[PDB]
Amino acid sequence: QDLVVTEDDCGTHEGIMMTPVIEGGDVKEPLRDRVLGRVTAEDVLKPGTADILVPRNTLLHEQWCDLLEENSVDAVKVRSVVSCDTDFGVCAHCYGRDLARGHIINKGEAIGVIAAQSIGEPGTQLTMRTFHIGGAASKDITGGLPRVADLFEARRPKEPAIL
Amino acid sequence: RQMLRKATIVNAGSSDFLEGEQVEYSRVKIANRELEANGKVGATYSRDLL
Amino acid sequence: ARVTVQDAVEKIGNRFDLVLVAARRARQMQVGGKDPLVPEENDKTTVIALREIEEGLINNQILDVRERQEQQEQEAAEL
Amino acid sequence: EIKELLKLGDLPTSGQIRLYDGRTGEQFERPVTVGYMYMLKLNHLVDDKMHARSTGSYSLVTQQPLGGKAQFGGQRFGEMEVWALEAYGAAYTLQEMLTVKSDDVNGRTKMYKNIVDGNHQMEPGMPESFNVLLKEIRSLGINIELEDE
Amino acid sequence: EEFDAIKIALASPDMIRSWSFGEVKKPETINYRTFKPERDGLFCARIFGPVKDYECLCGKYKRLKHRGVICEKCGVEVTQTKVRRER
Amino acid sequence: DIVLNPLGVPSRMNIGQILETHLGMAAKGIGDKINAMLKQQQEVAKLREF
Amino acid sequence: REEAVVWDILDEVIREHPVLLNRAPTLHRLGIQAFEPVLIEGKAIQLHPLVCAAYNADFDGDQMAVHVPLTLEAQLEARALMMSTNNILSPANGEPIIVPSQDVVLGLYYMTRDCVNAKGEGMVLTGPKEAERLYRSGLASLHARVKVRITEYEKDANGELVAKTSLKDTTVGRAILWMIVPKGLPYSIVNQALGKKAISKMLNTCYRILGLKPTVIFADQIMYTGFAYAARSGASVGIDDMVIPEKKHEIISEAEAEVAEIQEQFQSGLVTAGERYNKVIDIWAAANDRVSKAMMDNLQTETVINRDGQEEKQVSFNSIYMMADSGARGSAAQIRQLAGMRGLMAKPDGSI
Amino acid sequence: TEFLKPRLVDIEQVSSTHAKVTLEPLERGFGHTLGNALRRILLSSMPGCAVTEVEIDGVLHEYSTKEGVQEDILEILLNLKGLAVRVQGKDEVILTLNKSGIGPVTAADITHDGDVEIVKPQHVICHLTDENASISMRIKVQRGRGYVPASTRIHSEEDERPIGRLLVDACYSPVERIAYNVEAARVEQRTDLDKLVIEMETNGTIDPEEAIRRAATILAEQLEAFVD
Amino acid sequence: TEFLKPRLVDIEQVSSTHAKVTLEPLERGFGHTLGNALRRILLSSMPGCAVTEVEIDGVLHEYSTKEGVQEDILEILLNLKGLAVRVQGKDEVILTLNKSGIGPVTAADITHDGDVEIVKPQHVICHLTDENASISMRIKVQRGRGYVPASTRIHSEEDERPIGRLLVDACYSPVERIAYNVEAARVEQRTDLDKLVIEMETNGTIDPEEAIRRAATILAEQLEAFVDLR
Amino acid sequence: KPLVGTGMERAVAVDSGVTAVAKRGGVVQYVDASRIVIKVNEDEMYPGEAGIDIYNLTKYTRSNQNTCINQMPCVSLGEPVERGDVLADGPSTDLGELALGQNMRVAFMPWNGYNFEDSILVSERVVQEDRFTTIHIQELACVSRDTKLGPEEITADIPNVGEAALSKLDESGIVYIGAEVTGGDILVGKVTPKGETQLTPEEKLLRAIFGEKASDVKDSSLRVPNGVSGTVIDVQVFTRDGVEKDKRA
Amino acid sequence: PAGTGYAYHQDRMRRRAAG
RNA sequence: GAGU
Ligand SMILES: [Mg+2]
Ligand SMILES: [Mg+2]
Ligand SMILES: [Zn+2]
Ligand SMILES: [Zn+2]
C-alpha cells in the first residue's frame, strides 16, 4: 500500500548483482531481459570489444542492453528497491523503468499497489483459465500458489537445512 | 522490502529503545544519523523478516 | 492532445503535474473566462489546456508569474 | 449416413458451399460450412440488463447510494476497483467516488450545482459513513477522537 | 472539519458521560398509537433531538423563528433533525 | 440468417454444432426437394416414392 | 419528453468528455480504462476489440460498468493517466498488452502466407498499390510468389528518416500489408508469414522506434485489415477439416495386443500389479504420442499436391491447422482430441 | 418512392494524385452498392494509355542484362509500366528514346510526338553508369482499358512477333488505387444513413475528380435502357 | 471509350411470383458490376403495399381471443402481414371484410375496391369454427417501402389512435428473393461479352419488368450526384 | 420445431403437461381458440355420461419469469383423434414436439470482427419475420392503504394531471383494457392524505401570489415503469368486505 | 498521498512542518 | 441465476 516513489535519487551506492539465470543449462531468463530498464549501480570496466563503461545511475535502454550482449557481460550490479536508502518510500533510480510507460518511473507513483496487483492477478486468473478449460490429462496453479504463499508469509519449512 | 520493514534492537541506543523493542528500520537509521552527529550511545539492532 | 497525450507529457514531464497544470488552466477558462491562446476549433477547455501545454505556452511557473503580476497590480491599485 | 442424406439433397459431401459477399458480389476465397443450426434466444435480454444513474435515493445509515437496477442503484466501486485507481494514480477521480459521488452530503449537492453552472469544481468533505464508524466505536466504549490541526 | 490525526484510547466512565446528552432509562421505543418517541426511551427526542427539522415534539415551537429554543411543555430542543444521528 | 465465428470451434471442442449444421442442411435440402415437388404438383405416387 | 434539441445538446456535451469502463473482477489497473464515448442508438455498450485482452472480455454475454469523471481534474486524470491509448504496456512485464487476437491474427496470417505458384507466380510489380490493384482485379492470389519494388524507410542517427528502394521477393499479400506498415520500420518484418507471435514483436518494434502515436494508429490499421482479410478468406470449419491419420486402427490394435501381453504376464503372478499398471500406462502414453505425430505429419504437410514442373510438397492450408499455426485459436493439443486419439484420462483422485 | 439523393460534400485533394471524397447522406445499404460498383468501373474500366510493347536494340530478352546499365531489363520494363503518357489524337504511338552518357535517363529524354504528352518528365527509366554506354529503344504505347497482362496477350496472340520485341503488361487504367470506406451519417431522425468516403490514387493526365465523373457516367449509360 | 449498352432480352415469367430475366450483351465485368448493385437495391429500396392497421369489432387488443375463431388475434394479424395486395390508384385504402358461417376465410372474401387487386385470393386469414360466428373487420393497406414495424411507428407516433385499432408491422418490400447468374454472350468478334440472368421471386403483383425499371432508376438517380455535382 | 432433434422432444413436451393431451380418443366436436370439445368413441365412452370431453385452453397468462404462457389448438374441427394425442400445444411445443427455439441458416466464417469473441452477426430478415420476437407479461399493482391520516383513495382526481394522461383512465381512475402505454403513463390513479408541512417563505409568497392553495391530497399513482411499454390486457380489482366498490370493479 | 495527490499532499506537509 |  504505502510504498510510493518519494525521491529522485537516494544517493546510494547499493544494489543486487544479477546473473543470467542458467538454472540447469538453458538460459531461462537472459541477463538482458532480467535487467532491462534498471539503473546500473556501479560500472564494470572490462576493456572488451565495444569499450563499455556505462556509468553509474544509468537506466538500461535497449541500446545499452544490446551493447552488453556484444560484450558478453557476465553479471551486473543493479540498483534495487530493497537496497534503497530512501526512508518512507523508494527513489525513481532504485526502481527504474515504469514498465507500463517504457521510460523512467515518475516520482509520486504508487508502486506498491501496482506490484501487488501485478503479482496477484495472473494467479487469480490462471485459477480460472486452466480450470473452466482444464480438462484432459497428458499440478497447474492449485499446487503452485500454496508454495508462493508459504514464501511471502515467511513460513519456516518442515525439515530445514542447517547453516 | 515490505517484509523487511521492522528490526529488533539488541542493545540500548541514546534514546529509549533498549533491548528487544522492535522498531521500523527507517526510524532507527534516521536516529543513527543523529547519533553520528551527536555521538552518544549508538543503537545496535538487527533487521527481522516478517 | 485529444487522443494521445505523449508529447504533452514530454513537455512537462511528470504526468501527475501535467494533470494539475492543465486542470488549473482549464479552471481559469471555465470560471474566470480567461482567453485561450490556441484556436479552440470547437474544443473543450481541457483539450485547449493540453494543446497549449504541448506547444509550450502554459507552464506551472508561468502560471505563477501571471498570478503574481496581476495580483500585485491589484494591490497597487488598492493603494 | 449424413453425407448420404446430403447426396439425397444434391448437397455437397463437405457440407461447405460457395458463398458470395452481399456487399461486393464477389465470392469468398474458399467454401464455407453452411447449414441449419437450431438456436435459442436466452432470457438475458439487454432490455433488462441496461442501467444508468446520475443521482437518486441514498441509503439510510451509510448514506451511500443504494444497489440494484430495480432500486435505481449505483454500481459498487469496490476495493478491487479502488486499487485500480491507486495504481493509475488518479487521485481526484478516486476521491470523487469516495465523497461527492457517495456519502459526502454537502459535497454532492454542491458539486451538482457547480456542474449545472459549468464549473466542474470539486468541493469535497467527509464521508458520512466514516462519522458513523466513529459513533459505532464509541458505542462500543472505545474513545476514538479526532485531534484536529 | 479537517483534522490532522486520530487517536484511540480507553473510554473512561466519565468520558462516556461527556458524549451523552441523556440517560436512557426505559426500553420504550415509541408510542404504539402516536408513533412518537417515548419519554426517556431508546429513541427519546428529549435526549437525541427532534424528529422533524426545527420542530419540537408537541409542536409548540416551529421553524427558524424559534432557533435554539427548548420547549417547556415537552422538553425538546428545536434544531436540525440531523442531530439524531449524532447525539 | 446468422454468421457465426468459426474460431470458437477447435478450442472449444463442441463439434456437435458442426455435425448439427451439416445434418441441418441435409434436413433442409430434403425439405426443399419436397417443397419443389409440391409446388410443381407431380402426384401422390411420385412424392411417396421419394 | 426527450426533445430533439436535447439530443443536439447531449451530443455537444459528450464531445471530448472521457468515460471510464470497468470489468469485473478488476485484477489489475487496466481493468478500468478511459475512452471517448461515441453515442449509439441501441442498448449495449460497444467495446474496442484490442483492449479485450486487458479486460479479459469475451462477448458471451459479458457486461461492463461505466463511470463519469465529473471534475476538470478527474476528466484530466482520465484522459492523461487512464486513456486506453496511453496505457498499452503491462505494468507487470514490459510487454504490449494490446495485441491482435483471433480473427485479426488469422487474417494477417492469411495474407502473408505463401502458396505454390497460384495466380501469377513470378510477376513483377511497381509498388504495393499495383499489387492491391492486381489482387482486387482478380489477376493474382494473395499467396502468389512475386517480385516487388518496395521503398523502406530506415530511421537515421537523428530524427531524420533515410529511405531505400529495393526489389524484394514477397507475396502480393505482404506487399499490401506494407501499406499499413509505417515508414520507419523495415520490410523484412512483414516479409515473413505473420502470426500472433510475430505481430506482438511488430508492435513492440514500432513502439520503440516510432513512439506512441504511430503505434496506436498502426494497431487500429492492423485490426481493420486483419478482420477484413479474415472475412474475404472464407475460412470455415467442416468435418472434413479434422483429418484422422490412416494408421490409427493398426497402431491401436498393436497397443492392445501389447497390453494383453502384460495382463497375461500378470495372471502368471510374475509381474506385480504396480509394475503392470505402470507399463500399461507407458504403452498408452507412447501410443498416444505416436498417433498424434501421425496426425500432425499427415495434416501439417498434406499439401503434397503441387505444381509448376511436377509434384511438390508444401504447408497445409487446412482450416484448423491454419488457426493453430497462426496462433489465432486452437493448438496441437486441442487438435489431438479432435482428429487424433483423445488419450488417457485422470480420475478425480488424480490417479490415471 | 421518396428518393433520397446524396450530395457531394468534401473533396480533400491531398495531392493531385491522391484525393479523398466524402459523400453524404446515403440511404442505408447504398454506401456499399454505389461504393463497390464505382470501384469496379474505376479500376478495370477507366480507359487510358499504357506501354504495350518494347524494343531495345542489343536486347534479345527481358532476363538479360545490358552493359553500362545499372538496371536489368526487367527493372526497366517495370518503370515503363509506371510511365504516364497522354496520347491526344491517335490510339497507338511508338515513341523513340536514344540517350547516352553518365545520366539517370528520365521521361524527358524521350522524343515527344506532336500529340503525345509525357505527364511526369522526371520519371526514372534507366540509369546509365558507363559514359560510353548509349541506350536506344522504341516503346509502343497503346490506348486500352483495365489491366491486360502480357500473359493474356501471348495466349490469344497467335500473331507471331519478331524476337527482340518485348511485350509488356498493360496497365491501361489511369486509376492506380481505389478504396471506399462507409461510416454512419447522422440526421435528427435518420441515424441509419451512411457516408461514403472514396480514396482515389491516380496517375498523370486523368484527374481524380474527373475520373469519378466519368465512371458515374459509364454506369448511367448502362442504366439508360432500363430507365426507359 | 468503347461504350456498349445492354438491351432487355427475355422475360421468362415462369410464375407470377418467380421470373427469370436474361439480359445481353454486357461488356466484360459489367455482368457482376450491375448484377450486384441491382440486387442490393432490389432487396431494400423496392416499394410496395402492406397492411398497416387493423380494426376488428369486438376486439380491444391483439392478445385477446375471439369466440368461434380458431386463430387468436395475433395469428390473424400474422396472416395479414402476408396478404398480397396491389393498389392501382391511391396510396392508401381501407378494405372491409364481413364473413360468417363455418368457413376458412380467404382473401376472396374481402370486398375488393375498384382499384384494389387481391393477388392471392386463396390466402388464408382466419378459420371460423362456429357457424353462428361472424367476423367483421377493416384492414388499412398503405403503400411504403422496406420494413416499418409497429414499434417504429408507436415511438414516433405521438398521434393517438382510438383503442380498438390495431397497428401492424408493415412489410412493404415485395422482393422475396433475388439472384443473378453471369454466362458468356457470344458475338462474331466479341466472345468476351457476358449475359446477365436475373432470377427474381417476389410476392404478388410487382411486375418483374417494372421492378427492374424502377431499381435501375433509383441507381441512376444516385449517379446524378456524382456526375452533375462533379 | 427443431430440424436436428433427438427424439426426447416429444416425450418432454407431453410429459411436462404444458400441452393439452386427449384423455379419450374420438372425433373433435368443436375446436376453438379458447377450448376444445371432443366426442368420445363408443368403445372407450362410458355408458353413464354423455361422453363428450371438454378442455378449456389457458390463454395468454403470466409466467414466473414474466414470459407468456398461451395454449394453441393443434387439431382441426371434425378430426378423429387417438387417446394420448396432443390436442393443443403449450408455449414452446409444436405438434407434440418440444420447440425451444428456432432453426436457421448459419454460415461459419469471420466477418469484419462483428463476430469477434462469440459475437453474433444476424440478418435483419430474422427480425422482420419476428420469429425471435417474444412476449412478456408483466404485473403492476396499485395498493390503497389506510393510514394514520386517513385512507388513500383510488380516484382519477389527482393534483396536476394532464387531460392527455386522464384520457386513458376511466371514471374510477383505472386504465382501460386495450390501452397502449409507455413509461410515465398513469395506470391506476391513487392519492394520499398529506399532513402538515412547514411551507418555506418562498412558497408562502408564491401561494399568496397565485392563490392556488395546495390541496390536502398528494399523488401516489401507479405508473408505467420507465422505458417499458406495452398494452394493458387485463385488470383485476380487490376490495375489502365492506368498502364501497369502484365503478370499474 | 500519491499520484496526482502527491503535489497537494506535499503542500499540506510543508504547512505541517512550518507550524 | 450472469462473466470471469
Ligand atoms: Mg471467450
Ligand atoms: Mg465471458
Ligand atoms: Zn535508492
Ligand atoms: Zn414542545
Q: How many CA atoms lie within 13 A of G303 on its CB side?
A: 15
Q: Whole-angstrom Cα distance, residue F23 to residue D2? A: 6
Q: Which residues contact H187 (CB under 8 A, 6 or more apart)?
A: H25, H193
| CA end-to-end span of chain B | 10
CB contact under 8 A, H32 and D25: no
Tell me the three cell numbers of residue G260.
494383453
Sheet holding G145-155, edge to edge: G123-125, G145-155, G161-171
Q: Whole-angstrom Cα distance, residue F16 to residue F31? A: 22
Q: Which of D120, D121, D122 to mutate to test the interface with C (most CBs of C within 10 A)?
A: D120
What is the fold of H1-47+173-228? Gyrase A; domain 2 (3.30.1360)
Q: Which residues contact A33 (CB under 8 A, 6 or more apart)?
A: none
AA identity, residue I154: I
Q: In this structure, how many other beta carbons lie within 10 angstroms of the beta carbon of residue J215?
A: 12
Tell me the three cell numbers of residue J138.
408483466
AA identity, residue H224: E
Label the pairing between strands J20-21 and J86-89. antiparallel
For helices G103-112 and G196-209, the axis angle rounded to 10 degrees is: 90
Resolution in A: 3.6
Q: Which residues contact C64 (CB under 8 A, 6 or more apart)?
A: none
Residue of A14, A1, A2, A11 whose CA lies nearest to A89: A2
The three-state (H, E, C) secondary structure of chain B, written as one string = CCCCCEEEECCCCCCCCCCCCEEEHHHHHHHHHHHHHHCCCCCCEEECCC
Chain D residues near residue H36 by CB distance under 8 angstroms: 23-25
Residue of E45, E44, E64 whose CA lies nearest to E54: E64
What is the fold of I1-47+173-230? Gyrase A; domain 2 (3.30.1360)
Q: Which of D85, D92, D97 to mutate to test the interface with K (most CBs of K within 10 A)?
A: D92
The three-state (H, E, C) secondary structure of chain I, written as one string = CCCCCCEEEEEECCCCCEEEEEEEEECCCHHHHHHHHHHHHHHHCCEEEEEEEEEECCCCCCCCCCCCECCCHHHHHHHHHCCCEEECCCCEEEEEEEEECCCEEEHHHCECCCCEEECCCCCEEEEECCCCCEEEEEEEEEEEECEECHHHHHHHCCCCCCCCCEECCEECCCEEEEEEEEEECCCCCCCCCEEEEEEEEECCCCCHHHHHHHHHHHHHHHHHHHHCCC
Chain D residues near residue K2 by CB distance under 8 angstroms: 86, 89, 91
CB contact under 8 A, G92 and A98: no
Answer positive or negative: Cα dihedral of E1, E7, E12, E16: positive
Q: Whole-angstrom Cα distance, residue D97 to residue D94? A: 5
Chain I residues near residue D24 by CB distance under 8 angstroms: 36
Q: Whole-angstrom Cα distance, residue J21 to residue H114? A: 95
Residue D37: phi and psi, rounded to 5, are -100, 135
Label the pairing between strands E3-10 and J97-98. unpaired
Q: Whole-angstrom Cα distance, residue I90 to residue G253? A: 80
What's the total number of domains in chain C? 1
Is D6 part of the contact surface with chain F (CB cutoff 8 Å)?
yes
* Inter-residue contact G20 to G34 (CB < 8 Å): yes
Class of domain I48-172: mainly beta
Tell me the three cell numbers of residue E39.
419519554
Residues of chain H with CATH 3.30.1360.10: 1-47+173-228
In CATH, what number is assigned to the domain containing residue J37?
A: 2.40.50.100
In this complex, the nucleotide whose C1' atom is nearest to the CA atom of residue G63 is: L3
Q: Whole-angstrom Cα distance, residue J85 to residue I213? A: 54
The parent domain of residue C40 ranges over 1-79
Label the pairing between strands I166-167 and G145-155. unpaired
Residue J136: phi and psi, rounded to 5, are -130, 125
Q: Which residue of J has its CA nearest to G225?
A: J112
Q: In this structure, how many other beta carbons lie within 10 angstroms of the beta carbon of residue I214?
A: 20
**Chains with 3 or more CB pairs closer than 8 angstroms to C?**
A, D, G, K
Please tell me what DSSP assigns to residue J173: S
AA identity, residue E74: C
Residue I26: phi and psi, rounded to 5, are -110, 135
Q: In this structure, how many other beta carbons lie within 10 angstroms of the beta carbon of residue E68?
A: 7
Q: Whole-angstrom Cα distance, residue H36 to residue H30? A: 10
Label the pairing between strands G123-125 and G145-155. parallel
Tell me if residue F6 falls in helix, strand or coil. helix
Q: Which residues contact H14 (CB under 8 A, 6 or more apart)?
A: H20
Chain A residues near residue G57 by CB distance under 8 angstroms: none
Label the pairing between strands I134-145 and I147-148. unpaired
Please tell me what DSSP assigns to residue A40: B
Q: In this structure, how many other beta carbons lie within 10 angstroms of the beta carbon of residue H156?
A: 8
In this complex, the nucleotide whose C1' atom is nearest to the CA atom of residue G61 is: L3
The three-state (H, E, C) secondary structure of chain H, written as one string = CCCCCCEEEEEECCCCCEEEEEEEEECCCHHHHHHHHHHHHHHHHCEEEEEEEEEECCCCCCCCCCCCECCCHHHHHHHHHCCCEEECCCCEEEEEEEEECCCEEEHHHCCCCCCEEECCCCCEEEEECCCCCEEEEEEEEEEEECEECHHHHHHHCCCCCCCCCEECCEECCCEEEEEEEEEEECCCCCCCEEEEEEEEEECCCCCHHHHHHHHHHHHHHHHHHHHC
Q: In this structure, how many other beta carbons lie within 10 angstroms of the beta carbon of residue I134?
A: 14
Q: Whole-angstrom Cα distance, residue E77 to residue E54? A: 8
CB contact under 8 A, E7 and D144: yes
* Inter-residue contact D147 to E6 (CB < 8 Å): yes
Q: Whole-angstrom Cα distance, residue A25 to residue G351? A: 32
- Map grid coordinates 483423445 to a residue: G342
- Angle subtended at Cα E20 by Cα E14 and Cα E25, rounded to the nearest 5 degrees: 100
- What residue has its CA nearest to the C1' of L3? G62
* Inter-residue contact I148 to I104 (CB < 8 Å): no
Q: Whole-angstrom Cα distance, residue G229 to residue G105? A: 10
**Chains with 3 or more CB pairs closer than 8 angstroms to D?**
A, C, E, F, G, H, I, J, K
Query: What was the structure determination method?
Result: X-ray
Is I171 part of the contact surface with chain J (CB cutoff 8 Å)?
yes
AA identity, residue D6: L
Of the candidates F4, F6, F26, the beta carbon closest to that of D9 is on F26
Q: Is residue G33 packed enough to be buried (19+ CB in 10 Å), middle (13-18) or exposed (0-12)?
A: buried
Tell me the three cell numbers of residue G297.
505429419
In CATH, what number is assigned to the domain containing residue G262?
A: 1.10.132.30
* Inter-residue contact A108 to A5 (CB < 8 Å): yes
Q: Whole-angstrom Cα distance, residue H169 to residue J180? A: 69
Label the pairing between strands J222-223 and J186-188. antiparallel
CA dihedral C21, C22, C27, C32 (to 10 degrees): 90
Tell me if residue K1 falls in helix, strand or coil. coil
Is A109 part of the contact surface with chain K (CB cutoff 8 Å)?
yes
The parent domain of residue G254 ranges over 239-352
* Inter-residue contact G198 to G178 (CB < 8 Å): no
Residue of I168, E68, J106 whose CA lies nearest to F3: J106
Q: Which residues contact J22 (CB under 8 A, 6 or more apart)?
A: J38, J53, J81, J82, J83, J84, J85, J86, J87
The 10 Å CB-count burial string (b at 16+, else e) for J172-196 is: bbbbeebbbbeeebbbbbbbbeeee
